[PDB]
C-alpha cells in the first residue's frame with residue numbers, strides 16, 4: 565500500500581510556498597476552473613508554459629495557474645514538491661473544494677507523483693494528472709551516478725539509480741495514484757529509456773494511460789523532450805485527457821491524422837517560435853545554477869524506502 569495518514573510537514577514556510585504560486589487573472593483563494601502547471605528542470609512556470617499550455621488551457625476554459633520553485637527547478641525535488649502540494653491545497657479550497665487537473669512537463673511529472681505518493685491529502689484534490697515526458701525512473705543518458713559530473717540537486721535525483729527514484733518506486737509510486745495519462749516519445753534525447761512501449765519506459769505508470777507517440781504515430785514520428793510538451797499531437801492527447809469522463813485520455817479521441825510534431829496549431833506565431841526554443845532558458849539556468857558532487861539527502865518521510873543508497877551525508881540507514 566501507499567503511504568497513508570498525515571501529510572509530512574513542509575520544510576519551507578507557507579508564505580514562501582505561496583510566493584511561488586500564481587494564477588492568471590485571479591487570486592488562488594478565489595479562482596474559477598484552475599489547472600496547475602508544474603514546470604521542467606531549469607525553468608520557471610512561465611518559461612515552461614507561456615508558449616504552450618498557459619494559452620491552450622485557457623482556451624479550453626481553465627484558469628492557468630503555475631508554480632516556479634527557485635532556482636528554476638534546480639533545487640531538491642522534494643522541496644519543489646512542497647510548492648506543488650501547497651498549491652493544490654490552496655487551489656482546491658479556492659475553487660470551492662472542487663478537484664483540479666495537474667499538467668506537467670519533464671521533472672514536473674516526477675514532482676507530481678512524488679507529491680501524490682507521500683502527501684495523501686492531495687489525492688482527493690487532484691482530478692487527474694496529464695504528464696508530458698515524465699521521468700519517473702530518471703534518465704540513463706546522464707550516465708551512472710559514480711561518473712556524473714557536478715550537477716544540480718534535482719539533476720542528481722533524476723539520474724537513474726538515484727535514492728529519490730529508488731524511494732519513489734519502493735513506496736509504490738510507479739503505479740498511478742489518481743487517473744493519469746503519460747505522453748512520451750521514443751526519440752526523447754533527454755530521458756531514456758523510452759523506446760520499449762512497455763513498463764521499462766521511464767514515463768510508464770502501471771494502470772495509467774501510457775501513450776508512447778510512436779505507438780500511435782509510427783516509427784518515423786519524431787518529437788524530442790520539449791516537443792513531447794508542445795506538439796499539436798500532444799495537444800490532442802492532452803485535450804482528450806482533460807475532457808475524458810474516466811480521467812485518462814481515450815484512444816478514440818486521437819489518431820494518425822493528429823501526428824503533427826510542430827507546436828500546437830492554436831498557438832500564435834510568436835508562441836510557436838517560443839515553443840520551438842523552449843529548452844534554451846533551461847540550459848542557461850543550469851550553467852549559472854547550483855552544482856554538487858552528491859545526491860541530496862532524502863527527507864525523513866522518504867528515507868525508509870531507499871535504505872542502502874548513498875546521498876550527500878552518506879549511506880541511508882534504517
Ligand SMILES: C[C@H](C(=O)N[C@H](C)c1ccccc1)c1ccccc1
Nearest residue numbers: 605703706719722723754843846847
Ligand atoms: C537538467 C537536465 C536538462 O533538463 N537539460 C536540458 C534539457 C538539456 C538539453 C540538451 C542538452 C543538455 C541539457 C536533466 C537532467 C536529468 C534529467 C532530466 C533533465
Ligand SMILES: [Cl-]
Nearest residue numbers: 733734735736
Ligand atoms: Cl512496491
Ligand SMILES: [Cl-]
Nearest residue numbers: 770771772773
Ligand atoms: Cl486498470
